[PDB]
Amino acid sequence: GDTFIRHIALLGFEKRFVPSQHYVYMFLVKWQDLSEKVVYRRFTEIYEFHKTLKEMFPIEAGAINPENRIIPHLPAPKWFDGQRAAENRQGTLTEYCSTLMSLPTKISRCPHLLDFFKVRPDDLKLPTDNQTKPETYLM
């Protein structure tokens, strides 16, 4: 078509400390030119992106007729301890991203989605403090 994403894989997550302590999920994004780029997104940013996508495509969100829903589900930020919930979260984000790429191309190649997964300055140059590195969890 143009510029678009061919594949989105979840590689794991990182525990960040700067500027504050939080988790980011690590995605490998394959583009139409076959480049593979790493980007990092917190769960709340993914969830907000999800809500924006549902608002754009109310038919596929099931907002008119719920049996017509094809946008994958994403459980709210429930901050839930134990790694059953953690195995559910990496698993549900993995499933979410794979299912996005099977949607009809009006959604899977929509510019809003492409823009969400484009590299940010801090995807290229991670924030550091001399007095503080992130813990990486590839799994």
PDB file of C-alpha atoms in Angstrom:
ATOM      1  CA  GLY A   1       0.000   0.000   0.000  1.00  0.00           C
ATOM      2  CA  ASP A   2       2.511   2.611   1.272  1.00  0.00           C
ATOM      3  CA  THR A   3       4.137   2.892   4.695  1.00  0.00           C
ATOM      4  CA  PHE A   4       2.502   0.350   7.002  1.00  0.00           C
ATOM      5  CA  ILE A   5       3.253  -2.223   9.691  1.00  0.00           C
ATOM      6  CA  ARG A   6       3.584  -5.905   8.788  1.00  0.00           C
ATOM      7  CA  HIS A   7       4.040  -7.397  12.275  1.00  0.00           C
ATOM      8  CA  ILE A   8       4.012  -6.362  15.938  1.00  0.00           C
ATOM      9  CA  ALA A   9       5.671  -8.703  18.460  1.00  0.00           C
ATOM     10  CA  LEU A  10       5.850  -8.274  22.233  1.00  0.00           C
ATOM     11  CA  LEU A  11       9.461  -8.978  23.290  1.00  0.00           C
ATOM     12  CA  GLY A  12       9.114  -8.524  27.040  1.00  0.00           C
ATOM     13  CA  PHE A  13       9.146  -5.489  29.305  1.00  0.00           C
ATOM     14  CA  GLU A  14      11.521  -3.183  31.173  1.00  0.00           C
ATOM     15  CA  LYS A  15      11.429  -1.754  34.660  1.00  0.00           C
ATOM     16  CA  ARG A  16      12.323   1.942  34.326  1.00  0.00           C
ATOM     17  CA  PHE A  17      13.445   4.240  37.135  1.00  0.00           C
ATOM     18  CA  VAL A  18      13.963   7.663  35.477  1.00  0.00           C
ATOM     19  CA  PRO A  19      12.218   9.851  35.700  1.00  0.00           C
ATOM     20  CA  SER A  20      10.014   7.592  37.792  1.00  0.00           C
ATOM     21  CA  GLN A  21       9.596   3.880  38.509  1.00  0.00           C
ATOM     22  CA  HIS A  22       7.310   2.193  35.986  1.00  0.00           C
ATOM     23  CA  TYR A  23       7.083  -0.657  33.499  1.00  0.00           C
ATOM     24  CA  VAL A  24       7.277  -0.294  29.725  1.00  0.00           C
ATOM     25  CA  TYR A  25       6.375  -3.098  27.291  1.00  0.00           C
ATOM     26  CA  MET A  26       8.857  -3.748  24.479  1.00  0.00           C
ATOM     27  CA  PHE A  27       7.526  -4.157  20.966  1.00  0.00           C
ATOM     28  CA  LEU A  28       9.322  -5.217  17.817  1.00  0.00           C
ATOM     29  CA  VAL A  29       7.612  -3.522  14.867  1.00  0.00           C
ATOM     30  CA  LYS A  30       8.220  -4.809  11.340  1.00  0.00           C
ATOM     31  CA  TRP A  31       7.508  -2.150   8.653  1.00  0.00           C
ATOM     32  CA  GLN A  32       6.714  -2.511   4.936  1.00  0.00           C
ATOM     33  CA  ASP A  33      10.400  -1.860   4.115  1.00  0.00           C
ATOM     34  CA  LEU A  34      11.259  -4.874   6.332  1.00  0.00           C
ATOM     35  CA  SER A  35      12.926  -2.765   9.028  1.00  0.00           C
ATOM     36  CA  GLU A  36      12.454  -4.097  12.576  1.00  0.00           C
ATOM     37  CA  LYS A  37      12.272  -1.347  15.191  1.00  0.00           C
ATOM     38  CA  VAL A  38      12.045  -1.541  18.984  1.00  0.00           C
ATOM     39  CA  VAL A  39       9.579   0.755  20.736  1.00  0.00           C
ATOM     40  CA  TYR A  40       8.508   0.949  24.369  1.00  0.00           C
ATOM     41  CA  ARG A  41       5.008   1.751  25.633  1.00  0.00           C
ATOM     42  CA  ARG A  42       3.480   1.733  29.109  1.00  0.00           C
ATOM     43  CA  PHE A  43       0.284  -0.235  29.577  1.00  0.00           C
ATOM     44  CA  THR A  44      -1.797   2.879  30.247  1.00  0.00           C
ATOM     45  CA  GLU A  45      -0.645   4.397  26.910  1.00  0.00           C
ATOM     46  CA  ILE A  46      -1.623   1.188  25.093  1.00  0.00           C
ATOM     47  CA  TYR A  47      -4.989   1.200  26.848  1.00  0.00           C
ATOM     48  CA  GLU A  48      -5.604   4.846  25.912  1.00  0.00           C
ATOM     49  CA  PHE A  49      -4.620   4.069  22.331  1.00  0.00           C
ATOM     50  CA  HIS A  50      -7.117   1.168  22.392  1.00  0.00           C
ATOM     51  CA  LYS A  51      -9.927   3.473  23.526  1.00  0.00           C
ATOM     52  CA  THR A  52      -9.046   5.928  20.727  1.00  0.00           C
ATOM     53  CA  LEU A  53      -9.219   3.123  18.160  1.00  0.00           C
ATOM     54  CA  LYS A  54     -12.619   1.961  19.407  1.00  0.00           C
ATOM     55  CA  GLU A  55     -13.900   5.540  19.169  1.00  0.00           C
ATOM     56  CA  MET A  56     -12.740   5.769  15.528  1.00  0.00           C
ATOM     57  CA  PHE A  57     -14.373   2.514  14.411  1.00  0.00           C
ATOM     58  CA  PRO A  58     -17.659   2.096  16.327  1.00  0.00           C
ATOM     59  CA  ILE A  59     -18.907  -0.696  14.058  1.00  0.00           C
ATOM     60  CA  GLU A  60     -15.878  -2.937  14.671  1.00  0.00           C
ATOM     61  CA  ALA A  61     -15.877  -1.845  18.319  1.00  0.00           C
ATOM     62  CA  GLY A  62     -19.400  -3.305  18.659  1.00  0.00           C
ATOM     63  CA  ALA A  63     -20.797   0.091  19.655  1.00  0.00           C
ATOM     64  CA  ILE A  64     -23.763  -0.243  17.329  1.00  0.00           C
ATOM     65  CA  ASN A  65     -24.247  -4.067  17.374  1.00  0.00           C
ATOM     66  CA  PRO A  66     -22.044  -5.968  19.865  1.00  0.00           C
ATOM     67  CA  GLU A  67     -22.023  -9.141  17.781  1.00  0.00           C
ATOM     68  CA  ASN A  68     -20.201  -7.132  15.111  1.00  0.00           C
ATOM     69  CA  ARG A  69     -17.250  -6.511  17.388  1.00  0.00           C
ATOM     70  CA  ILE A  70     -13.855  -7.561  15.992  1.00  0.00           C
ATOM     71  CA  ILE A  71     -11.484  -5.120  17.774  1.00  0.00           C
ATOM     72  CA  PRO A  72      -9.700  -7.246  20.387  1.00  0.00           C
ATOM     73  CA  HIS A  73     -10.381  -6.833  24.038  1.00  0.00           C
ATOM     74  CA  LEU A  74      -8.052  -5.266  26.507  1.00  0.00           C
ATOM     75  CA  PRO A  75      -8.722  -5.502  30.294  1.00  0.00           C
ATOM     76  CA  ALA A  76      -8.548  -2.095  32.036  1.00  0.00           C
ATOM     77  CA  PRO A  77      -5.497  -1.201  34.079  1.00  0.00           C
ATOM     78  CA  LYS A  78      -6.293  -3.421  36.904  1.00  0.00           C
ATOM     79  CA  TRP A  79      -3.026  -3.195  38.837  1.00  0.00           C
ATOM     80  CA  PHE A  80      -2.998  -6.845  39.879  1.00  0.00           C
ATOM     81  CA  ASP A  81      -0.122  -8.442  41.700  1.00  0.00           C
ATOM     82  CA  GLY A  82       0.586 -12.166  41.413  1.00  0.00           C
ATOM     83  CA  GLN A  83       1.942 -13.373  38.125  1.00  0.00           C
ATOM     84  CA  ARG A  84      -1.242 -15.114  37.144  1.00  0.00           C
ATOM     85  CA  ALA A  85      -2.321 -11.528  36.421  1.00  0.00           C
ATOM     86  CA  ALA A  86       1.167 -10.764  35.080  1.00  0.00           C
ATOM     87  CA  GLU A  87       1.036 -13.845  32.769  1.00  0.00           C
ATOM     88  CA  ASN A  88      -2.373 -12.663  31.711  1.00  0.00           C
ATOM     89  CA  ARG A  89      -1.023  -9.105  30.928  1.00  0.00           C
ATOM     90  CA  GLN A  90       1.948  -9.983  28.735  1.00  0.00           C
ATOM     91  CA  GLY A  91      -0.237 -12.695  27.206  1.00  0.00           C
ATOM     92  CA  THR A  92      -3.155 -10.355  26.655  1.00  0.00           C
ATOM     93  CA  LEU A  93      -0.883  -7.642  25.119  1.00  0.00           C
ATOM     94  CA  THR A  94       0.727 -10.269  22.850  1.00  0.00           C
ATOM     95  CA  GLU A  95      -2.684 -11.506  21.720  1.00  0.00           C
ATOM     96  CA  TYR A  96      -3.905  -7.922  21.279  1.00  0.00           C
ATOM     97  CA  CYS A  97      -1.070  -6.877  18.961  1.00  0.00           C
ATOM     98  CA  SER A  98      -1.298 -10.074  16.893  1.00  0.00           C
ATOM     99  CA  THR A  99      -5.044  -9.600  16.517  1.00  0.00           C
ATOM    100  CA  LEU A 100      -4.638  -5.946  15.428  1.00  0.00           C
ATOM    101  CA  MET A 101      -2.634  -7.081  12.409  1.00  0.00           C
ATOM    102  CA  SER A 102      -5.473  -9.409  11.319  1.00  0.00           C
ATOM    103  CA  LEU A 103      -8.064  -6.640  11.315  1.00  0.00           C
ATOM    104  CA  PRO A 104      -9.321  -5.263   8.009  1.00  0.00           C
ATOM    105  CA  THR A 105      -6.690  -2.915   6.579  1.00  0.00           C
ATOM    106  CA  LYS A 106      -8.846   0.185   7.223  1.00  0.00           C
ATOM    107  CA  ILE A 107      -7.957  -0.415  10.880  1.00  0.00           C
ATOM    108  CA  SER A 108      -4.711  -2.430  10.767  1.00  0.00           C
ATOM    109  CA  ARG A 109      -3.107   0.182   8.437  1.00  0.00           C
ATOM    110  CA  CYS A 110      -4.884   3.257   9.767  1.00  0.00           C
ATOM    111  CA  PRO A 111      -2.486   6.198  10.109  1.00  0.00           C
ATOM    112  CA  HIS A 112      -3.474   6.658  13.764  1.00  0.00           C
ATOM    113  CA  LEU A 113      -2.230   3.126  14.559  1.00  0.00           C
ATOM    114  CA  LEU A 114       0.910   3.522  12.463  1.00  0.00           C
ATOM    115  CA  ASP A 115       1.659   6.785  14.295  1.00  0.00           C
ATOM    116  CA  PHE A 116       1.274   5.168  17.720  1.00  0.00           C
ATOM    117  CA  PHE A 117       3.984   2.590  16.948  1.00  0.00           C
ATOM    118  CA  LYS A 118       6.482   4.991  15.269  1.00  0.00           C
ATOM    119  CA  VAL A 119       9.742   5.505  17.132  1.00  0.00           C
ATOM    120  CA  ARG A 120       9.755   8.310  19.730  1.00  0.00           C
ATOM    121  CA  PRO A 121      12.906  10.240  20.793  1.00  0.00           C
ATOM    122  CA  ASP A 122      13.040   8.195  24.008  1.00  0.00           C
ATOM    123  CA  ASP A 123      12.715   4.922  22.004  1.00  0.00           C
ATOM    124  CA  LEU A 124      16.070   5.892  20.450  1.00  0.00           C
ATOM    125  CA  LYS A 125      17.744   7.585  23.359  1.00  0.00           C
ATOM    126  CA  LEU A 126      16.537   6.201  26.654  1.00  0.00           C
ATOM    127  CA  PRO A 127      16.479   8.696  29.560  1.00  0.00           C
ATOM    128  CA  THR A 128      19.339   8.175  31.969  1.00  0.00           C
ATOM    129  CA  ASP A 129      20.467   9.819  35.213  1.00  0.00           C
ATOM    130  CA  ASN A 130      24.048   9.483  36.347  1.00  0.00           C
ATOM    131  CA  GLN A 131      22.859   8.699  39.883  1.00  0.00           C
ATOM    132  CA  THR A 132      20.402   6.009  38.977  1.00  0.00           C
ATOM    133  CA  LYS A 133      20.018   1.282  34.217  1.00  0.00           C
ATOM    134  CA  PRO A 134      16.570  -0.105  33.537  1.00  0.00           C
ATOM    135  CA  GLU A 135      16.045  -3.775  34.194  1.00  0.00           C
ATOM    136  CA  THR A 136      15.248  -5.595  30.957  1.00  0.00           C
ATOM    137  CA  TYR A 137      13.053  -8.716  30.878  1.00  0.00           C
ATOM    138  CA  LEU A 138      13.157 -10.477  27.501  1.00  0.00           C
ATOM    139  CA  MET A 139      10.846 -13.445  27.697  1.00  0.00           C
TER     140      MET A 139
END
